[PDB]
Design a protein around this ligand. Structure first.
Ligand SMILES: O=C(CO)[C@H](O)[C@H](O)[C@H](O)CO
Ligand SMILES: O=C(CO)[C@H](O)[C@H](O)[C@H](O)CO
Ligand SMILES: O=C(CO)[C@H](O)[C@H](O)[C@H](O)CO
Ligand SMILES: O=C(CO)[C@H](O)[C@H](O)[C@H](O)CO
Ligand SMILES: [Mg+2]
Ligand SMILES: [Mg+2]
Ligand SMILES: [Mg+2]
Ligand SMILES: [Mg+2]
Lengths: 284, 283, 283, 282
């Protein structure tokens, strides 16, 4: 997987037949290599219609999700593997090449205590199976680190690497998010350096989830590190500029993050491409 | 209220006799003008002892707090006023010059929805009462903006200014935190600029709660904005480097933020001092 | 003088009749409020032609120059006054609102020694007289600070301010350039802050003279300081992307700075507008 | 060659017996692994005395110079080789492990035109010879890129790499300077990235030649790049804080760069060490 991506959330998080059409077609209009398709309601995902759309617009896909609470792997590793395998099935049916995101827990997950090795054993058992399942489908399996307020288990790139190395699969990659690294990494570039080998996917997101280029992410440190490690993965824009008011609680976002989705699509995607160009990402 | 401050959490969040002594003495060893004293359990605090130690060590103080959930002002405004007024009595008894922090709500406060006008009405009425009570004590009253994961009501400087202006009280000030602004402000310095009439207190906190100067906060933008708006208040280091493991759930902190408090104190307080001098803060 | 400007060097440094139309039309084409028109040798400039085009395309103008060595005010103040006064006449004729740039010396000027008081006296005498002439013509007079390798006299905003204060005119303003400030200012925002009473003109120039947004200028600190001090002048793009190889020695530019002027105009002018909006420079 | 260095200009560029003592003792007092010793007046240096002071305080050294104008390699390549080998002999006698700096030209060198192929042919010839002489001495040979106003020949990391590769020697490294990179590199970390194969030496220098961490150099981008490419050479602080006012012309510095050398050494070396630890450089 290599190139520029846009998260389907730039148009919607639904994936009914015309939500899929609007996001895929729009991602083709912005000349992206990949679209990131959220898997929220797995039953209501039409993989044949989606695959038809992807092939019509010449667009590759990766899938992402956050584990719902019944399926959090730190406490319920068996419902985790169930949910993760049923989402991998839908991702493979659809033509997507990977499942990534918060595949090990929730974005509202909290015990009140530090992570315990029992929790990590649960994560390791659950994730080694669903990754093994991903292998049979030819898929790669992503682990995205999020900030301390969303999850207590995988916050830094170092925790993500250590978890990957414990599972010991060969198709798991580390997925990092500049919105989360802006808090969790002691110098954002250290997260990219720490993940080095396993880093194949980036959420390129401004510090306020608005427009990359107009916030506090140190983008020159980010692209410097990405270039110097020889990154050949996907750079996917993630912004909450299109998120509906209905979604506020699920993303702890209580006010507008930007002026509107189309300005974020214009200025944000151009910014990532221009900055990729300045640092010769993919220039080898 | 002007100068360099350090939050007492660099030594402990506890405030019994021995922790009070250790925190105040520590602040004095690092030449600070202010110590920020947290008010967690008001009955367990010996204000006259604290007052005597502040004078012995020649230290000024600000108190700070987070409202416990029975007293969140957005839903329980009358309980908020009772808790804040008792907190202000203890602050005044200590000889503190202000009560600041999350004086309007919690740091685990969330409705699941955007803040409503009713919630802001409750906040407005409650804080007018307690700032009024603060005024009778000779104390200023601060509103600290915190990030979207801790509270849904006051996240950006603009929300803080707007609430301050709704209250209309002459002794309220905006209190900004670089850790929170690093997420909430569209360009951190825009927060300082938005708040320029009311900004009198800063938490200078690195983006990972570690050591200022060694993370993701754009300190030159912070210090330029502070200098250009003419800032005259207190610059208070806040770091989690001394926090005990038992605090983890309270501060949503799951792993060490730095090596130890002694290094954060040494390097972080010097970094703040050297940047202030570079940008001629305070002249 | 307020708004968004672009230097005519994005199309050519020659101001013959058709260079002027393609420069004025280009700046009009990119929505700019101002064009900055260079005055290299004054007899070459057809002022009647230019005022017509400025009227036609709805475009205001400022003129800029660098003193030629026979007229360096450091050493030859009366030659400087004659040169400045003649350029002021041409600027007034074509309807420019100001003459700015290195109006006090050269961009390859040095003595091998730090600037002396006698040198500043010569500078004061010349700029005093020529700023008076400019005042009679309704024109403001600008002094642009440049880095230590171009000139030994006016490098920091502080030096520019102190000179403007010496002269005591009311129509002299400080002109700063982010390319030179990136070297000269101890924290780029400190230059803007130092000039807050006099800053009416910016060259917004990337650290390598390329494209704003793609270099080492800390634009967040630049724009925050501009907003915080309430800047109301002109933000003018300076880039060398259109300079021909034959200008190399005059601008110490030995290799490409970008991939053509059109890209710099597209991305650089948009960047300055987008950042000015982020920090509410003009509303 | 690895560790933290300080340029002897922090105490003086005169290398008489007492100034060498003050400098080398100073760099020891600040716990440095290296001191960078400038070579300007060759007959005035006691190599035996310096080697002694180095070995006494357990300090490693690299030498640096700028070519005097009669020996600018671009136009006078035979004079350049003569001068470089002379400095190299002195460097090896001192116990230094490399000769670096503007070893190919001047800091006021200017033709009025962009660099020519003929000039680069001259550079390649003189540098390949003098690097050959360095190898027989057990020394490495450094090439420092400087900004467009001091030199028209080696300004970007990319030009330094191209030159190094055309010489084809084993013991030539690229040497960068954040003060010059802050003007020349399109994103300062791009210079470190482009020079990755050959970068063995840094001048860690603030944008105004003052105190590192208190100017415009994007230090997190610098250190990120250095960490990400696996840099394992020398980080040497360069600052004009100790320079006398009679040096102004040689360095085009017309006003103080900081309040004093002592605070630059105290704050700058501390800042570089703290950032090096933050990014796990060594
Ligand atoms: O950034 C994220 C939320 O913290 C993750 O990328 C989520 O998966 C996001 O909602 C996209 O699926
Ligand atoms: O930053 C903060 C938490 O969000 C607060 O300022 C402190 O933790 C608290 O208010 C101090 O009493
Ligand atoms: O930047 C400048 C000189 O270094 C000035 O703005 C000049 O006016 C510009 O180069 C055109 O002469
Ligand atoms: O940065 C430099 C001059 O521009 C070089 O490091 C000089 O050679 C310095 O004086 C070293 O001796
Ligand atoms: Mg993400
Ligand atoms: Mg705080
Ligand atoms: Mg200029
Ligand atoms: Mg150097």
């Amino acid at each position: 997987m290599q190139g520029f991506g846009v998260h389907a959330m730039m148009w919607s998080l639904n994936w009914d037949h015309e939500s899929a059409r609007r996001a895929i077609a729009g991602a083709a209009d912005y000349g992206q290599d990949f679209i990131e398709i959220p898997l929220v309601d797995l039953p209501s995902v039409d993989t044949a219609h989606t695959r038809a759309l992807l092939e019509k617009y010449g667009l590759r896909a990766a899938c992402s999700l956050v584990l719902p609470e019944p399926a959090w792997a730190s406490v319920r590793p068996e419902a985790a593997v169930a949910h993760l395998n049923a989402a991998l099935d839908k991702a493979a049916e659809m033509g997507a090449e990977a499942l990534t995101g918060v595949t090990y827990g929730g974005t509202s997950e909290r015990t009140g205590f530090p992570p315990t090795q029992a929790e990590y054993d649960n994560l390791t058992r659950a994730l080694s199976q669903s990754a093994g399942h991903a292998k049979t489908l030819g898929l790669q399996f992503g682990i995205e680190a999020v900030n301390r307020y969303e999850n207590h288990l995988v916050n830094s790139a170092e925790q993500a690497v250590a978890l990957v190395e414990r599972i010991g699969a060969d198709n798991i990659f580390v997925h990092l998010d500049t919105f989360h690294m802006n808090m969790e990494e002691k110098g954002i570039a250290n997260g990219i350096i720490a993940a080095h080998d396993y880093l194949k996917y980036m959420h390129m997101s401004e510090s306020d989830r608005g427009t990359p280029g107009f916030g506090n992410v140190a983008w020159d440190a980010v692209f410097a590190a990405l270039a110097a490690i020889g990154f050949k993965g996907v750079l996917t824009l993630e912004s909450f500029a299109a998120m509906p008011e209905e979604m506020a609680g699920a993303i702890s976002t209580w006010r507008p993050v930007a002026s509107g989705a189309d300005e974020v699509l214009d200025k944000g995607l151009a910014f990532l491409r221009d900055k990729a160009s300045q640092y010769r990402i993919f220039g080898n």
